[PDB]
Amino acid sequence: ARVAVLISGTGSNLQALIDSTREPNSSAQIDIVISNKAAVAGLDKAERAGIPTRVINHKLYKNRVEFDSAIDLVLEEFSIDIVCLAGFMRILSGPFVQKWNGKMLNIHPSLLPSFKGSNAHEQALETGVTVTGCTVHFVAEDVDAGQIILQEAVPVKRGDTVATLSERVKLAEHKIFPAALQLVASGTVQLGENGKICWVKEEHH
């Protein structure tokens, strides 16, 4: 499967994803990284890795649909099969999300449905949970919404700060984002017609 990563900044987990695709039995290759913002660190990560990049500036388009159509055209040109969102900060239009239904993954630094929205590590600490985690899911129209592929529980430790909790969750993300991509890229996990996850036994051995 040919994979695009959409970013807006540092491309968190992008290196984890690249490294996983270089493993011997990978089902995925990262073929393009697209940012809506010029000269961000995630672009440099992609370029240093030899991966094509594009910048699509939302200010050059009249509205969200036209902007997202420009993203989709690049995806079409590069024959992309699967999109991963790695810190992408714009809300994708309904038409775009519908088109990519079941082929677009995002990650969130909580065990959804807990701690939706921004600042999930601070929300976990303020709430006083002892277990948090991260979640990889298919993207649906409501943000953080969409069917869950993988989750990993991560402990909150006595004394944690936002920084120490965030680095522990990030280590889990580095595990589950590539693992989820491989499941989807291999066809082991697909989104069924019923809109629920399907774990498929593949014909090819």
Tab-separated table of C-alpha atoms in Angstrom, residues 15-180:
chain	number	residue	atom	x	y	z
A	15	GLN	CA	9.876	8.819	11.807
A	16	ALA	CA	8.272	5.877	13.598
A	17	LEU	CA	6.108	5.323	10.503
A	18	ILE	CA	9.053	5.667	8.093
A	19	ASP	CA	11.218	3.259	10.057
A	20	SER	CA	8.446	0.662	10.168
A	21	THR	CA	8.037	0.746	6.381
A	22	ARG	CA	11.702	-0.067	5.937
A	23	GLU	CA	11.316	-3.307	7.848
A	24	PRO	CA	11.611	-6.461	5.688
A	25	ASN	CA	7.963	-7.581	5.728
A	26	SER	CA	6.333	-4.171	5.540
A	27	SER	CA	3.062	-3.807	3.675
A	28	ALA	CA	3.401	-0.029	3.401
A	29	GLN	CA	5.657	2.563	1.826
A	30	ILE	CA	5.528	6.270	2.634
A	31	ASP	CA	5.316	7.946	-0.750
A	32	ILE	CA	4.500	11.541	0.121
A	33	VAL	CA	4.296	13.913	3.102
A	34	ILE	CA	1.971	16.884	2.652
A	35	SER	CA	1.948	19.923	4.943
A	36	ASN	CA	-0.401	22.884	5.003
A	37	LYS	CA	2.467	24.973	6.414
A	38	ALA	CA	5.833	25.725	4.775
A	39	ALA	CA	9.201	24.883	6.352
A	40	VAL	CA	7.928	22.947	9.331
A	41	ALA	CA	10.062	20.293	10.983
A	42	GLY	CA	8.036	17.367	9.671
A	43	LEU	CA	8.880	18.377	6.116
A	44	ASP	CA	12.557	18.357	6.922
A	45	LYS	CA	12.100	14.879	8.491
A	46	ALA	CA	10.488	13.610	5.270
A	47	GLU	CA	13.035	15.267	2.973
A	48	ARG	CA	15.964	13.966	5.008
A	49	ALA	CA	14.446	10.520	4.567
A	50	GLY	CA	14.184	10.922	0.772
A	51	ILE	CA	10.380	11.129	0.720
A	52	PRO	CA	8.621	13.578	-1.597
A	53	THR	CA	6.840	16.490	0.005
A	54	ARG	CA	4.256	19.073	-0.991
A	55	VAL	CA	2.965	22.232	0.721
A	56	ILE	CA	-0.705	23.192	0.163
A	57	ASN	CA	-1.487	26.609	1.616
A	58	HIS	CA	-5.108	26.981	2.691
A	59	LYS	CA	-4.910	30.742	2.138
A	60	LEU	CA	-4.708	30.181	-1.641
A	61	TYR	CA	-8.185	28.581	-1.754
A	62	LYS	CA	-11.610	30.104	-1.284
A	63	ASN	CA	-12.836	27.579	1.292
A	64	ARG	CA	-12.181	24.283	3.053
A	65	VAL	CA	-13.642	22.162	0.292
A	66	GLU	CA	-11.378	23.732	-2.368
A	67	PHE	CA	-8.355	23.404	-0.076
A	68	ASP	CA	-9.076	19.733	0.676
A	69	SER	CA	-9.717	19.098	-3.037
A	70	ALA	CA	-6.166	20.346	-3.705
A	71	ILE	CA	-4.846	17.867	-1.105
A	72	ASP	CA	-6.888	15.091	-2.720
A	73	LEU	CA	-5.486	15.912	-6.163
A	74	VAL	CA	-1.934	15.415	-4.881
A	75	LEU	CA	-3.042	12.153	-3.278
A	76	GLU	CA	-4.538	11.109	-6.658
A	77	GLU	CA	-1.355	12.079	-8.565
A	78	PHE	CA	0.770	9.973	-6.227
A	79	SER	CA	-1.667	6.982	-6.443
A	80	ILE	CA	-2.076	6.991	-2.674
A	81	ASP	CA	-3.958	4.148	-0.997
A	82	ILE	CA	-3.851	5.149	2.717
A	83	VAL	CA	-3.501	8.495	4.549
A	84	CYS	CA	-2.053	8.909	8.041
A	85	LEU	CA	-2.584	12.187	9.922
A	86	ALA	CA	0.491	13.170	11.953
A	87	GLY	CA	-0.358	16.392	13.770
A	88	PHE	CA	-2.594	17.710	11.022
A	89	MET	CA	-4.414	20.743	12.434
A	90	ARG	CA	-7.091	21.592	9.927
A	91	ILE	CA	-10.597	20.076	9.973
A	92	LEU	CA	-11.106	17.962	6.832
A	93	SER	CA	-14.331	18.546	4.935
A	94	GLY	CA	-17.144	16.060	4.813
A	95	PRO	CA	-16.519	15.272	1.114
A	96	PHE	CA	-12.866	14.522	1.808
A	97	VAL	CA	-13.503	12.371	4.867
A	98	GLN	CA	-16.241	10.418	3.003
A	99	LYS	CA	-13.893	9.722	0.100
A	100	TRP	CA	-11.154	8.459	2.401
A	101	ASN	CA	-13.479	6.554	4.736
A	102	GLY	CA	-11.694	3.446	5.943
A	103	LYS	CA	-8.306	4.409	4.513
A	104	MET	CA	-7.331	7.382	6.758
A	105	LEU	CA	-5.837	6.940	10.232
A	106	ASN	CA	-5.189	9.370	13.087
A	107	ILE	CA	-3.836	8.994	16.629
A	108	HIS	CA	-4.888	10.603	19.880
A	109	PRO	CA	-2.951	10.610	23.203
A	110	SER	CA	-5.754	9.150	25.296
A	111	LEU	CA	-7.830	5.998	25.542
A	112	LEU	CA	-10.770	7.372	23.595
A	113	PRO	CA	-13.506	8.199	24.338
A	114	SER	CA	-11.754	9.813	27.363
A	115	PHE	CA	-10.054	13.190	26.995
A	116	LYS	CA	-11.190	14.243	23.570
A	117	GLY	CA	-9.762	17.396	22.133
A	118	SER	CA	-6.556	19.157	22.864
A	119	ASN	CA	-4.303	18.805	25.881
A	120	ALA	CA	-5.216	15.215	26.711
A	121	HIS	CA	-2.127	14.703	28.908
A	122	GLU	CA	-3.070	17.753	31.045
A	123	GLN	CA	-6.703	16.507	31.167
A	124	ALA	CA	-5.464	13.080	32.410
A	125	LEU	CA	-3.320	14.664	35.109
A	126	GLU	CA	-6.047	17.122	36.230
A	127	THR	CA	-8.614	14.306	36.406
A	128	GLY	CA	-6.286	12.014	38.387
A	129	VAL	CA	-6.536	8.846	36.384
A	130	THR	CA	-3.928	6.163	37.019
A	131	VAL	CA	-4.254	4.718	33.448
A	132	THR	CA	-4.258	6.671	30.233
A	133	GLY	CA	-2.964	5.652	26.801
A	134	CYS	CA	-3.201	6.262	23.080
A	135	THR	CA	-5.666	5.366	20.354
A	136	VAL	CA	-5.275	4.880	16.598
A	137	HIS	CA	-8.561	5.167	14.701
A	138	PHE	CA	-10.049	5.654	11.292
A	139	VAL	CA	-11.109	9.238	10.706
A	140	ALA	CA	-14.854	10.037	10.629
A	141	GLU	CA	-16.451	13.493	10.339
A	142	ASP	CA	-16.407	14.305	14.123
A	143	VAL	CA	-12.844	14.775	15.346
A	144	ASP	CA	-11.449	11.993	17.527
A	145	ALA	CA	-14.478	10.096	16.121
A	146	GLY	CA	-14.176	7.053	13.890
A	147	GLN	CA	-13.615	3.385	14.454
A	148	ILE	CA	-10.818	2.332	16.770
A	149	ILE	CA	-8.064	0.130	15.352
A	150	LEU	CA	-5.604	-0.195	18.249
A	151	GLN	CA	-5.241	1.197	21.773
A	152	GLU	CA	-2.439	0.890	24.293
A	153	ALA	CA	-2.788	1.583	27.997
A	154	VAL	CA	-0.033	3.675	29.642
A	155	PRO	CA	0.300	4.238	33.376
A	156	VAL	CA	0.238	7.642	35.049
A	157	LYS	CA	3.088	7.650	37.580
A	158	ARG	CA	3.179	9.344	40.936
A	159	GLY	CA	4.940	12.636	40.288
A	160	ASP	CA	4.358	12.881	36.592
A	161	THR	CA	4.330	16.187	34.806
A	162	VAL	CA	2.748	16.958	31.422
A	163	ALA	CA	6.226	16.384	29.978
A	164	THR	CA	6.984	13.040	31.590
A	165	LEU	CA	3.479	11.644	30.901
A	166	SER	CA	3.626	12.961	27.325
A	167	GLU	CA	6.987	11.182	26.640
A	168	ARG	CA	5.632	7.907	28.048
A	169	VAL	CA	2.505	8.117	25.876
A	170	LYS	CA	4.667	9.105	22.865
A	171	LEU	CA	6.713	5.919	23.249
A	172	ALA	CA	3.414	3.954	23.099
A	173	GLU	CA	2.342	5.964	20.022
A	174	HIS	CA	5.631	5.090	18.317
A	175	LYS	CA	4.563	1.421	18.763
A	176	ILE	CA	0.869	1.537	17.859
A	177	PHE	CA	0.792	4.025	14.996
A	178	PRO	CA	3.081	1.858	12.790
A	179	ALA	CA	1.415	-1.359	14.007
A	180	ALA	CA	-2.024	0.020	13.022
